[PDB]
Paper text:
pmcMaackia amurensis seed lectin (MASL) is a plant lectin isolated from seeds of the M. amurensis tree. MASL has a strong affinity for sulfated carbohydrates and α2-3–linked sialic acids. Consequentially MASL is utilized as an agent to identify these residues on various proteins.
Here, we present a high-resolution cryo-EM structure of MASL revealing that its tetrameric assembly is directed by two intersubunit disulfide bridges. However, the cryo-EM structure reveals additional stabilizing interactions within the MASL tetramer including hydrogen bonds between residues T210 and Q221, as well as between the carbonyl group of Q221 and K186 residues, which further stabilize the canonical dimer interface and prevent its dissociation. Each monomer harbors a calcium and manganese ion located within the external loops, resulting in the tetrameric protein structure harboring a total of four calcium and four manganese atoms, as shown in Figure 2, A and B. A structural comparison between previously reported substrate-bound MASL and the apo form of the lectin obtained in this study shows that the overall rotameric positions of the carbohydrate-binding site residues remain largely unchanged (RMSD = 0.56 Å). However, in the apo form, the Y250 residue is rotated approximately 90 degrees, closing the carbohydrate-binding cavity and creating a steric clash with the position of sialyllactose observed in a substrate-bound MASL as shown in Figure 5, A and B. The flipping of Y250 is presumed to occur as part of an induced fit mechanism, in which the binding pocket reshapes itself to enhance molecular recognition.
Residue numbers in the entry:
A (entry chain D), B (entry chain A), C (entry chain C): 30 to 273
D (entry chain B): 30 to 275
């Protein structure tokens, strides 16, 4: 509650402390696969979500304290066709009872089913969007991007990101509550490249007192499929008290 | 999984990260009450259990790694009648799907319903037994005690403990896996007294790979009731890898 | 040794756990001032260095283990004249017995006194260079930059950085040893801007087994002076063992 | 300062982050030896002290905040003659500039040189005293003990302790500042035995704002020598802020 820190360097099949929604699963080799894979090939129209079992406490209505946190993970996106990719994944905080919305949720990364932004969603996400289509995703920019989503698919702030096929990406997301700042960074040590972005968000009005952290991913047409994988994931959060 | 640490200095009503079984609840003042209390008075035949939402990983069958951990909490036992008290409470590790056994479970601290020890229980507990009755609890010693229970109410090792009515007790439980040692200590800073005990247990054969940690408490006849309360609770565990 | 973590949210005068070289000092208000300030005005030709008292263990020659670490701090650079600024500061790892080189060390940020790179220096730094002069600093680029220095002032990799006068900057430096990667990030939450850079370095050949971490800063001519301040600083490092 | 945590599972020769006073040293095998050992035999009249390089912040005079901390370590005491042992060792907090007092400091575990208690010492120690002599140590009880020392060799509180020759002991010392309580526990997993003690101390009046943590050990006559060794040592302290005073 006040403080919560965990680290998962490797995953196991049917992991107990992870709640899976959709078709997400963990392979025998120990890699967390949000999209089902048959004989080394990704499938089409596959949506997956994983969450940590324990809800995370963000703020208190009585005292007014608000939590600042930081997390880091390693993920891989590998597509048979480098030219075009489908949708992508995201790291998101949602209500504990959040479930997959009904209907077509591919272009929304399995988080929403409507393009409009509503304050009732109470979802705060950092998306790694690899699909820059204009007809299906008019809101997204022309290039592959890393964006911050607050109660809507239309990201308040995005940064151009150069995706590498079969490349391990080390991502870090840090929220500073006193400064009301969300920072997302991604690093490719294979080419030694960095992409960073920051935004101004206040979790008091957006998210409830208790939330759940996790990952989401989606896929589209069979021709433009891809594989999303997570190898490690570390999280730490503390609820500092304000006497003011 | 590999590492998990949390700290709860204060509790809130309907806490999300705590699973309650029986009649356990959290008061408005922020104290975790395993036994229901009416207008400042404990009730009779009340059994309560609380667990952490996230299961804890102890060991791996493939690598052979085993986790060592440590936890600390503060609890209060306050009875209207200091002469005689009912049952008591315990800090226990059990399977994630553990539920309250049917039948009379008061004298067993809400963990078992049979006096015999069976390896299928897979429950490892540290009990603070305040009831020294001989007819109902022939297994327990003549004095109030702190005991270690492994797959049975009959504690493998117990230490005499002087209970103080309305006294805050600071307890610490530490498991060292390489040495296969479980250590339980209790401190009263109001009188500056300490009671410690150690035992030899191996969680490989007893508990499964994934377990849940928490507290349990029970009460008996109305004349000899008592109030069990928990004010704070901190836990930390790491899964160190063995290359041997 | 194996693990070391500390956090200093506020500083105190004549702090015991900080070793000061040059004219660095801590103000009564609790801000770490590397450059001496008279009545709210910075001085000229002022060089300061601060280090943590405890040396940090990086690697072992026998086992071959190498440490990965992460640190974060907050710093402020405030100059009376926004047009031109002097030198700058840096976060550096050096030998425990490192001292200020003799001679003009202003343009070298108080770390070196020669422009050439020599492997005997054994200094690894992340510099926030605010002086883009060409005659005095031909090696530096045309713009204010954040650079990574390995045994020389000429940074192996630099990133353009927009300096803000009187603006609080939150910086984070993370070294991953298995991937041999050094990452430096800087954030301005007042304007919500981020600047990140990564480089490939191996501390085995560069630094010795035991090093000291800290900060350095320098100033130049009186007309182009500036004030360097540090408000908070957190560091954490672990020495993970490799069984390969 | 506000928070400081470190862990040393193994030691190395000439360790940089440890300050050694006296004849303490680290062996090639990686064990911290406070008393010099020749060819596997302890020596006589050997006094050693080790401290962590970084001073530890306990309290602030302005805000009034006071730090609570916890530490754990593993130590071995092995004597050729189990019948009688010399002096012992202790885990102590002292001023950063503390040095070995001049004169005979064997019976005082290398911390003091006078039996009387003076508030100017500013030393807070947890001693594992293995010498129960009455003529040389009239203050100590009749049995081997674990004691808490505050500005004096005469321990305010002691607990009987059964020493095991060549036995690994796991010790844990925890200070709770809001409750002003110091707790010391020792465990032998080889026989599964525990010895615990608690005392009431306030570091505000005793120790200064900045202190240094470490270990001390001493030896006596050649016939009753022993070897003191430390295998691992972990420390963690945090300075929690109190808004009641402010
Ligand atoms: C992220 O988080 C915080 C907010 O939570 C951001 O805001 C800064 O936080 C600091 C510390 O809380 C605050 O600094 C305050 O500045 C006040 C005014 O500054 C005086 O001193 C300077 C000295 O040069 C003068 O230039 C100036 O003219 C003023 O005279 C001070 O009054 C404050 O002191 C206070 O101390 C205690 C509380 O600790 C109070 O009880 C006192 O009454 C007193 O008021 C304090 O020093 C300030 O809110 C922000 N800093 C600024 C404006 O510089 C952080 O900026 C942000 N951190 C990041 C991004 O790293
Ligand atoms: C809790 O956990 C551990 C077990 O997990 C308990 O067991 C001790 O652990 C240590 C360290 O692993 C082991 O110590 C070993 O002792 C071996 C023999 O000792 C030699 O050296 C002494 C020096 O005085 C001589 O007296 C003696 O005659 C022997 O010559 C050594 O061989 C071991 O060294 C090994 O190092 C590496 C591994 O790190 C190996 O690759 C080498 O091949 C080499 O074998 C090692 O030093 C031993 O298992 C236990 N310690 C003993 C018996 O003293 C801990 O006791 C327990 N900790 C607690 C309760 O605090
Ligand atoms: C930062 O740090 C590490 C290096 O320290 C970087 O390197 C990766 O680290 C991982 C894990 O150590 C290594 O992955 C290895 O890949 C080997 C080959 O891959 C097989 O499996 C895939 C499955 O799709 C096939 O595609 C492929 O064709 C191969 O069949 C495996 O053999 C390795 O498994 C090993 O497991 C144990 C050790 O844990 C060994 O004992 C076994 O013998 C077995 O060899 C292992 O899975 C690999 O070194 C690097 N990953 C790669 C190449 O994908 C990290 O990339 C870097 N992390 C960042 C930047 O986040
Ligand atoms: C180690 O540390 C602390 C001291 O630092 C020791 O002292 C206890 O700490 C708690 C929490 O700070 C304090 O509890 C206080 O008790 C007050 C009175 O109790 C009322 O409620 C009970 C309910 O049964 C009634 O029985 C009783 O008659 C009273 O009606 C309360 O007033 C306090 O509430 C306060 O909350 C906030 C601060 O958080 C204040 O702003 C409010 O004004 C309000 O006063 C509070 O609940 C108390 O100091 C000590 N606990 C006691 C006496 O029970 C710890 O005991 C010690 N911990 C160990 C050894 O584990
Ligand atoms: C886009 O997403 C929204 C939100 O999901 C979606 O609106 C509704 O969401 C709910 C929850 O997923 C859908 O779930 C069920 O649909 C049927 C018919 O309602 C029933 O199984 C359930 O309805 C009963 O239970 C509700 C409990 O709140 C009651 O409110 C209700 O009165 C019924 O008793 C349950 O709602 C629901 O189907 C959709 N609504 C519709 C018309 O489908 C929205 O539909 C999505 N818009 C798209 C894809 O265009
Ligand atoms: C002491 O504790 C043991 C263990 O609880 C207890 O044995 C049985 O435990 C189960 C689980 O709590 C009891 O629960 C239910 O009882 C009835 C009748 O069986 C049904 O609701 C359920 O039985 C069905 O579901 C089971 C699923 O495994 C099937 O195995 C079974 O075939 C049925 O389909 C469920 O079991 C169960 O009642 C008790 N057994 C009895 C006779 O009560 C034991 O009874 C306790 N001994 C005491 C109090 O003396
Ligand atoms: C650029 O930096 C280098 C490295 O500092 C510098 O070379 C020498 O560095 C040392 C250490 O700071 C200087 O320090 C002293 O200088 C005088 C004369 O040597 C003496 O105080 C000392 O010399 C004695 O002690 C040394 C110990 O190693 C002995 O090696 C020596 O034989 C003497 O006994 C000590 O060295 C030293 O002055 C400089 N060398 C010179 C000529 O100044 C180098 O000078 C700098 N280059 C610049 C500014 O152009
Ligand atoms: C028991 O312990 C106390 C405390 O150590 C001891 O008193 C004195 O302690 C100091 C510090 O260890 C001893 O150190 C030196 O002794 C000589 C003579 O004084 C000098 O080297 C030094 O004295 C000079 O420096 C001092 C700095 O404070 C000045 O105060 C002084 O005026 C001198 O300029 C330094 O003190 C000191 O020797 C002892 N005092 C004596 C008489 O030895 C005490 O002696 C011990 N009692 C025993 C063993 O019975
Ligand atoms: C917080 O407390 C105030 C008390 O007036 C109440 O009005 C408000 O509804 C509460 N908000 C939440 C989310 O509980
Ligand atoms: C990264 O390095 C590899 C080396 O083979 C190279 O093939 C690839 O083109 C590089 N990618 C980028 C974006 O530089
Ligand atoms: C552990 O692995 C071995 C492989 O032979 C298997 O026999 C055993 O059943 C496994 N144990 C568990 C609890 O999975
Ligand atoms: C503890 O201290 C209080 C002080 O009032 C006293 O009443 C009580 O008897 C003491 N309890 C024990 C076991 O010493
Ligand atoms: C490391 O060990 C090898 C052993 O052959 C030795 O040659 C080498 O000099 C050592 N390196 C250092 C820096 O001690
Ligand atoms: C940052 O915000 C302030 C608001 O007053 C503005 O003055 C300043 O120009 C901004 N700086 C940048 C680089 O946008
Ligand atoms: C603490 O502050 C007060 C201010 O009046 C002062 O009198 C006292 O000497 C200070 N104590 C210490 C140890 O600095
Ligand atoms: C501890 O166990 C060993 C087993 O050999 C035994 O020799 C020794 O006497 C025991 N010590 C105590 C105090 O029980
Ligand atoms: Ca898209
Ligand atoms: Ca009983
Ligand atoms: Ca420059
Ligand atoms: Ca003695
Ligand atoms: Mn997008
Ligand atoms: Mn019992
Ligand atoms: Mn530069
Ligand atoms: Mn003694």
């Amino acid at each position: 509650s006040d403080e919560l820190s965990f680290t998962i360097n490797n995953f196991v099949p049917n992991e107990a402390d992870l709640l899976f929604q959709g078709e997400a699963s963990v392979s025998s080799t120990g890699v967390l696969q949000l999209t089902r894979v048959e004989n080394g090939q990704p499938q089409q129209y596959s949506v997956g979500r994983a969450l940590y079992a324990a809800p995370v406490r963000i703020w208190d209505n009585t005292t007014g304290s608000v939590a600042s946190f930081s997390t880091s993970f390693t993920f891989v996106v590998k597509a048979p066709n480098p030219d075009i990719t489908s949708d992508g994944l995201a790291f998101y905080l949602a209500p504990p009872d959040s479930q997959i919305p009904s209907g077509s949720v591919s272009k929304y990364l399995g988080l929403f089913n409507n393009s409009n932004s509503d304050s009732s969603n109470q979802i705060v996400a950092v998306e790694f969007d690899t699909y820059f289509g204009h007809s299906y995703d008019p809101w997204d920019p022309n290039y592959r991007h890393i964006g911050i989503d607050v109660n809507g698919i239309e990201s308040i702030k995005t940064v151009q990101w150069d995706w590498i096929n079969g490349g391990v990406a080390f991502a870090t997301i840090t929220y500073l509550a006193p400064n009301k700042t969300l920072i997302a960074s991604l690093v490719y040590p294979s080419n030694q490249t960095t992409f960073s972005v920051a935004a101004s968000v206040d979790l008091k009005e957006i998210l409830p007192e208790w939330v759940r952290v996790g990952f989401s991913a989606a896929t589209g047409y069979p021709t433009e499929v891809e594989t999303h994988d997570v190898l490690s994931w570390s999280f730490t959060s503390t609820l500092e008290a304000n006497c003011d």
